[PDB]
Design an enzyme around this catalytic site. Structure first.
Site, PDB file in Angstrom:
ATOM      1  N   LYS A 177       0.864  -1.168   0.000  1.00 42.31           N
ATOM      2  CA  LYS A 177       0.000   0.000   0.000  1.00 42.31           C
ATOM      3  C   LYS A 177       0.913   1.234   0.000  1.00 42.31           C
ATOM      4  O   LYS A 177       1.435   1.628   1.046  1.00 42.31           O
ATOM      5  CB  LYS A 177      -0.975  -0.003   1.186  1.00 42.31           C
ATOM      6  N   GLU A 253       9.034   1.377  11.575  1.00 50.05           N
ATOM      7  CA  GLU A 253      10.091   2.376  11.483  1.00 50.05           C
ATOM      8  C   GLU A 253       9.324   3.684  11.578  1.00 50.05           C
ATOM      9  O   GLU A 253       8.535   4.025  10.680  1.00 50.05           O
ATOM     10  CB  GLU A 253      10.893   2.230  10.176  1.00 50.05           C
ATOM     11  N   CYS A 287      13.739  10.178   7.829  1.00 51.97           N
ATOM     12  CA  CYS A 287      13.579   9.655   9.176  1.00 51.97           C
ATOM     13  C   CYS A 287      14.897   9.798  10.000  1.00 51.97           C
ATOM     14  O   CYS A 287      14.840   9.920  11.222  1.00 51.97           O
ATOM     15  CB  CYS A 287      13.153   8.195   9.071  1.00 51.97           C
ATOM     16  N   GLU A 384       9.927  15.835  15.567  1.00 52.90           N
ATOM     17  CA  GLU A 384      10.367  15.612  14.216  1.00 52.90           C
ATOM     18  C   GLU A 384       9.676  16.628  13.270  1.00 52.90           C
ATOM     19  O   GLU A 384       8.457  16.598  13.092  1.00 52.90           O
ATOM     20  CB  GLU A 384      10.090  14.177  13.807  1.00 52.90           C
TER      21      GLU A 384
END
Ligand SMILES: NC(=O)c1ccc[n+]([C@@H]2O[C@H](COP(=O)([O-])OP(=O)(O)OC[C@H]3O[C@@H](n4cnc5c(N)ncnc54)[C@H](O)[C@@H]3O)[C@@H](O)[C@H]2O)c1
Ligand SMILES: NC(=O)c1ccc[n+]([C@@H]2O[C@H](COP(=O)([O-])OP(=O)(O)OC[C@H]3O[C@@H](n4cnc5c(N)ncnc54)[C@H](O)[C@@H]3O)[C@@H](O)[C@H]2O)c1
Ligand SMILES: [Ca+2]
Ligand SMILES: [Ca+2]
Ligand code: NA
Ligand code: NA
Ligand code: NA
Ligand code: NA
Lengths: 486, 486, 486, 486
Positions: A177, A253, A287, A384
């Site tokens: 997906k 993750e 990331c 983040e």
């Protein structure tokens, strides 16, 4: 850029969504529509899972030897390499990524990773055990079965292969997906997999939205495992969805707040150039981006000045132009989110050294940003941002910087810049992050496992470890009679 | 010091040699006879091999689970620890080794290494394979059988256990031939093994001479594998004896000419103390002793002065005295050989900085010796002295010192003294030696494999690698029918 | 069949021998000369070793990443596959091997094995250790350097790649000495390696005689390791030559006297067909050929009759003809040796059931031979014949047959034919042979290690184990400071 | 039976709950109160996690070498062995387990499993990698940190050590939450750990209820990893709690519906005794109990008669009596749940062959029960009963029985009874369960990993795999300069 693959890929065929609906993908350079893509929902995921179930339960793919799956994956890797320009162009228009980096590093890096797993396919080993009874025990490594992959938009090609490469090498059938922002390249790969000889239903690609198609994969009663890369928030929903459906294992993750530590003995130009690379690569949309920069007091002042000069020299613009160093943010939401975080930094008392504002006529372009006088508990030091924003800080001691590096809920990666062997060993062993890069950055390698600690998630992508997560260990035991040794 | 174990240990019993002959062991402190030991020859080795053959072929030891062999080895290690004072005293009188180091390091280090293999005994694994046909393949790890061990005199206890520990843990039956200079502690261990529950014939100890008992082990038609530690010359004889008997595999630790490289950035006091330690530990009677010291030009002059101060102040004397740093050489032959090399050193044009002469009234004591102005083509720079003799040299570049470090027939170990991560990585990867010690020396560990390159030999002692050499790998394969995965 | 590669291959070039001399290769179908090949001696081996030394010490090959050596080996494997017909034809004319088997199994099996090592090249791992002190220890896996391979004539292609594949993948430079009877294909491979991108001096091929060229490789002072496959006698000279030169490690595959055990529960036709395959494949010229057939008393009589019918039906003739099942022996010496062994069997009282005589007008053709009433100590029951000769025997119990299977000085492989899980496990664990084939035979696989016990030699070919023998383990240790965990 | 350990064990001390509250533990033989135990809630778990956090972050335990943690665990195992009678007595009164099995198997099996991990402690290895760049990469194996363990009541000692053994060996600090039904032995182990030298805060035991203390461990923000064993329902709650707290990884053992397949060729008496053992051991209170018995049509009728004879003769009674084969169910809830399933079995049309009713005056005793004419869609064929209840069924073909064995939500373990090698291989590879026991049952071993497929959960207990789940993998990378090999 031309788009020829716009439908869902289910059971070795390109098909429209059951609903007949389509969604649009936009170019971050202009905000204009690139293509209309079939919009997969729960009904389409159900069809993909049934195709994957048939391919695994009764199909040839897991019945093939590891060597023959490897040969098919090696052909798949070769095809990626021959469509390098078209693939890079797709990723540049879908995600605003630099075309030159797509051709030179991103797309060939994916083909390279698929070769790594193709080469592992005929070498998978279990163990023969050492029983504490008159018995013969051994473990078998078997394909997990039907695997569901939910992937983000930042590195569309790379993320796709981190998941698909090891799962297909292990003998699994997959349902991918891709992110709504980046469905293009994933459909091109589904076409290349078929060309390579990947059998029908082994690789299914269902573009569509997260709470619809993505949630349908996570909650599916007939999916044996899910691997998810994305936000911390959605990671919680994926893990919960597994718990409330069939108790499928999950690997996550979830991003990070990567620190880069520069010691007094560092070469100033090297360390400035390294930090600039760590922070601004892919417009900070990684990331593992260098986000919290800790520079030792002896070189702090000269570092700030050099980092500011270099950031302000950065060419922001069209990612197709080879003179451009930084492209636009993925879309409007990301662009606006980075701008809110820049405003937050100013609001909480941090010092704006450079950038901190949008640039250009059109597109989602943000100037490379440096904040100094950043305190550890500030929002820009803890959250983040996923944008071209650096939090530049000072430290005195090794003990102090270890505490600062670990003062986060994340633990994905960290960078250390020092020449001293002892500082490097003490600091690397003390930072609670899955990947430590000493005097380098983004040192990813097909042979090196990658995965987070703490709120960065769990499980590994890359290395032999990634292959191991798509294999189940089966213990088989039988008694022994008249054995001359035990 | 009292000696209670003086006979051969064959088939779980202390027995006299078939001939009734005895040989004497002498104290290097006086040259006085310690005890008369049964002198094993070819006839006694034949009886030990037959006992080991019976214990392996029809006895309980290899039929035991790994866990139950481990429990016996753990008991054996505990017994060593309760006899530490007596064991250390035996190795001091026999090999001239420091009593304080025997008690604190050598004897407990042997018990520790024995615990490492006892803990490995129930964890030995083979593999389940990845066949390229519709077949199931796997490997079994089985005990080799009857193993012969030929050991030297320098570390009698340590060498004994490097060999015996892994071989017994694997399920083998052993025949140990200790050095004529040091048979004492090996007979005490044979007694402790029996007490621990090691079955009759599993551990046989045949003290005696090399060309008689030692050659009989190497040439035996019913010994499955041989491990030898000692001189290069005899290593050739052992390898040849295997080739001309039953083609048993061998492993050889043949000593070296270990270089220690000190770079400009080292802490001078630390580097000096480390080199002093590397060169003079156990009166230079170590296969890994620092013999060729290369000091970078920037610190060379201050290093020489500090090295001479430490070598000259070193307390030479009675190894039973705790204030003593250096005991006598093993025996007359070794003492005389070290003296011949000291004389060759002077005659070939090297500069005597300190020592270079015998000391004391009685005993085989030689003053710690430093030679400077040593050229790479000199005998003292090329041959293993096995004595308290340093060849101190200067270098300018990394490239130059890598060539100098490798300008030798040997490749056992090397020491590097630097704080810089890059120099340490470049130098360690470039030296052709089995063990690289960075900012430390003699960093042996039960978990770390140890073995040479080039003329230092092949095969590993210590680590899981040592256990692997006493196990055969057996590949077993069968076809598969109607498998849902491969 | 045309021969285009007749010279030595040294330093990436096809060159004549220093002497200018040539030797002839003959076709076993006629005994006629195929081609004149450059005759390498000690001078040519010295040039090849110097080329290999330069390629390893200063050349790009070991400096390449494992991935880039793998890509070159994958291209090399592809080239083998495109020259499949020519390569099979060369092996058929040089060695008398079946052309249909060369094309279908032998040559593609070699390309397949080279793909296995190409895929291993970027996955080689050492260990990070668990030190029992405040230290960081790890092992590095480094290429051994210059490797010398001495190969026999029975499977020229297969043997070449068993050695070359793993050594080249590890980063080594090689000097191959092919059998005087079969130098052809090895020179074609040297040409294909160059085409694939294998750098100059990395693969050197020195055709020539054994006591001249072969002995020069074994005794070379600058060769780091030797791998040898051939006779037990020469294996002794190779091991001795290593001992008397530089103490290079050696790995040896020395042939065997493989037993096949057929139990009462076996399907008679399957077991007869399997034994026929085990004994007569490649005219019995295989180190693992079924030579001693043990059939349980309940089915013995029916087995003999069926084995005799099947052997006498075997089509002996031109190996190029697809209707032919058995080609000629390699040459005159082998043919005459098999005839002497057949005479020995008759002389010592064994019963000749079928064959036992030469056939045809010309060529070295011997009829498939069956001897019954074979006693265990008879010459034909103890010596490797290397010909189409079966020793067919009877047994009553499992315990009895285990003793019979192990009543040999060899221990390479064994076959077991039973349906019972317990008999299969007891028998497989009790036979002292490196490879156990249950209800199959010649079940070699790139992932499965292959090597003997006892006088069959030591070391493994195939599997990850083969790769490990061309890698040295280097232990590197440094102290740790302020570590939060150990 | 006397109880001396009734308080919580937090920070190396036995303390009362913050609330001062206590709960009662009852004897299933009488329903009588054994002892009053301190009732830990969220406040006590918070204190235990803070103690575990201090012990890990600043304490000596993870700073110790693996060898020194192993020595303490070896001492801990020795102490368990000296208190075997008292420990077995505690598990009998607490869980209704057989005292003779406690002494002979359960308690020494725990000490043995603890020795297995003590022996692994000094042998933990990471890897040195094979980079595709001029870089040096390696992985470090570091302790996860603070680990939470939630354990069930069925095997109190065994479950405790499956979790505690590997986690303490790895260097972790643990918080154990034992089942409210069985807190006794866990507090005795906390006392023995302290005696052995396990430092304060390393092993904390918080007895208490599930939704209070157990939920507090699962949801804790400062617990790095959680391991849970118990019901599927609670497993969902634990996985969800991790997702909604800090995204800590979980491992879950959720029980099963284990099939035992008996083929036509089995020895009937052996197969019957094995199935009786599989179904009725520990009154069916085992996650791996034989629950669905499939017997091939050729022996079905004789199997039923023999199974009924063994089930009916089984001595049900006092677990302290050595002639007793089956003790009472753990408590009232379990007893009543087994009775409801027995009633559903009858109401759904199954045939009651034997038992199916409670027995005795007092205590939670249920007669061993056999149901025949069980259909695959019936509740007793699909739900985990956790009681002495067998579902005995017939099958014709291998293909049919593979489908029946896999017709379940679970995949923990399966038993196969056959003598044929091919059936055993086909069936074992085809059943989707973590453990396959061929011609044996409950073949657990410290060296063999144990864990489920499907709804039985994920992650392994036992083997080296269990140790791996308490270690993080950290990838460390640095560039290389002037390397002579890569
Ligand atoms: N590598 C080492 O650890 C080590 C240890 C001791 C001595 N040495 C070297 O050897 C010199 C001293 O010589 P050495 O005589 O003590 O060593 P050595 O090689 O002669 O003796 C080692 C062992 O081999 C045995 N041995 C001797 N001759 C034999 C033969 N023909 N066949 C089989 N076994 C035989 C000895 O009895 C002893 O047990 C030293 O100066 C040093 O260079 C090396
Ligand atoms: N898989 C196994 O080994 C196993 C063992 C015991 C019970 N069970 C299953 O469960 C049934 C009995 O139920 P049970 O109540 O004894 O098992 P359970 O799942 O409720 O309890 C197991 C452990 O989890 C704790 N727990 C309970 N509720 C919790 C919550 N909300 N959050 C966190 N921890 C919680 C308990 O206190 C106990 O320590 C049996 O019939 C059987 O099917 C399975
Ligand atoms: Ca000697
Ligand atoms: Ca409950
Ligand atoms: Na887009
Ligand atoms: Na002596
Ligand atoms: Na020929
Ligand atoms: Na209780």
């Amino acid at each position: 850029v031309e788009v020829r693959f716009t439908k869902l890929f289910i059971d070795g065929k390109f098909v429209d969504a059951v609903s007949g609906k389509t969604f649009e993908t936009r170019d971050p350079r202009t905000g204009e529509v690139i293509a209309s893509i079939a919009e997969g929902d729960k009904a389409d995921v159900d069809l993909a899972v049934k195709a994957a179930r048939e391919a695994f339960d009764n199909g040839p793919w897991p019945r093939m030897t590891g060597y023959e799956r490897g040969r098919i994956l090696h052909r798949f890797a070769d095809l990626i390499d021959e469509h390098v320009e078209e693939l890079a162009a797709l990723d540049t228009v879908d995600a605003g990524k630099l075309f030159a980096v797509g051709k030179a590093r991103d797309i060939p890096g994916a083909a390279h990773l698929l070769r790594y797993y193709a080469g592992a396919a005929d070498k998978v080993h279990g163990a023969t055990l050492k029983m504490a009874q008159r018995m013969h025990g051994y473990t078998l490594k078997e394909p997990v079965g039907v695997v569901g992959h939910i992937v983000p938009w930042n590195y569309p090609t790379t993320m796709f292969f981190f998941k698909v490469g090891p799962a297909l090498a292990a003998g699994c059938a997959v349902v991918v997906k891709p992110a709504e922002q980046t469905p293009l390249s994933a459909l091109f790969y589904a076409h290349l997999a078929r060309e390579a000889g990947v059998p029908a239903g082994v690789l299914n690609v269902v573009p569509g939205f997260g709470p619809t198609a993505g949630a349908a994969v996570a909650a599916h009663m007939d999916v044996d495992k899910v691997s998810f890369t994305g936000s911390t928030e959605v990671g919680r929903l994926v893990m919960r969805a597994a718990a409330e459906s069939n108790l499928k294992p999950v690997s996550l993750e979830l991003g990070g707040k990567s620190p880069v530590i520069v010691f007094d003995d560092a070469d100033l130009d090297m360390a400035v150039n390294l930090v600039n690379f760590a922070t601004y690569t892919n417009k900070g949309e990684i990331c593992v981006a260098g986000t919290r920069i800790y520079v030792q007091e002896g070189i702090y002042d000269e570092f700030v000045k050099k980092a500011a000069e270099l950031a302000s020299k950065s060419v922001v613009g069209d990612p197709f132009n080879p003179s451009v160093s930084q492209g636009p943010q993925v879309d409007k939401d990301q662009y606006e989110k980075v701008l809110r975080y820049i405003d937050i930094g100013k609001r909480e008392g941090a010092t704006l050294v450079t950038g901190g504002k949008p640039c250009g006529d059109k597109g989602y372009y943000i100037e490379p940003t440096i904040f100094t006088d950043v305190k550890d508990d500030m929002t820009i030091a803890q959250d983040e941002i996923f944008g071209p924003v650096m939090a530049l800080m000072k430290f005195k001691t090794v003990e102090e910087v270890i505490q600062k590096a670990n003062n986060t809920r994340y633990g994905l990666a960290a960078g250390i810049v020092t020449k001293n062997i002892d500082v490097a060993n003490t600091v690397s062993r003390s930072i609670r992050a899955g990947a430590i890069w000493i005097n380098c950055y983004f040192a990813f390698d097909p042979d090196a496992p990658f995965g987070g600690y703490k709120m960065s998630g769990f499980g590994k992508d890359m290395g032999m470890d990634a292959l191991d997560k798509y294999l189940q260990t089966k213990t088989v035991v039988t008694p022994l009679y008249n054995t001359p040794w035990l």
